[PDB]
């Protein structure tokens, strides 16, 4: 296995550290909706 | 509550028709269904006593 006389390896490895994760960004998510409908009006007794 | 008051008042508004009636007490009492009588004569009599 190509070691020392007591088991020490002659070749060393690498860790290969990851990229690490990413933060998630929150966006303005909107669903457009209208205003209320106009109902037909009545007529009063006063003047303008 | 006040807004509801105003809405009710304006929406149910109705400029009621106006009527005036003239009544004569002498004619009224003289024309009673059960006890028809002279009003002036009874007045003067009740004055006498």
TrEMBL record, chain A:
Protein name as catalogued: XptA2 protein
Organism: Xenorhabdus nematophila (Achromobacter nematophilus)
Name of the coding gene: xptA2
UniProtKB/TrEMBL annotation, chain B:
Protein name as catalogued: XptA2 protein
Originating organism: Xenorhabdus nematophila (Achromobacter nematophilus)
Gene (name only): xptA2
């Amino acid at each position: 296995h190509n070691l020392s006389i007591d088991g020490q390896p002659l070749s060393l490895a690498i860790y290969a550290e990851p990229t690490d994760p990413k933060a998630l960004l929150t966006s303005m998510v909107q669903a457009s909706q209208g205003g209320s409908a106009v109902l037909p009006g009545t007529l009063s007794l006063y003047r303008f | 509550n006040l807004a509801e008051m105003e809405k009710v008042w304006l929406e149910r508004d109705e400029r009621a028709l106006e009527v005036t009636r003239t009544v004569s007490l002498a004619q009224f009492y003289q024309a009673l269904s059960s006890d028809n009588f002279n009003l002036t004569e009874k007045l003067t009599q009740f004055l006498r006593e």
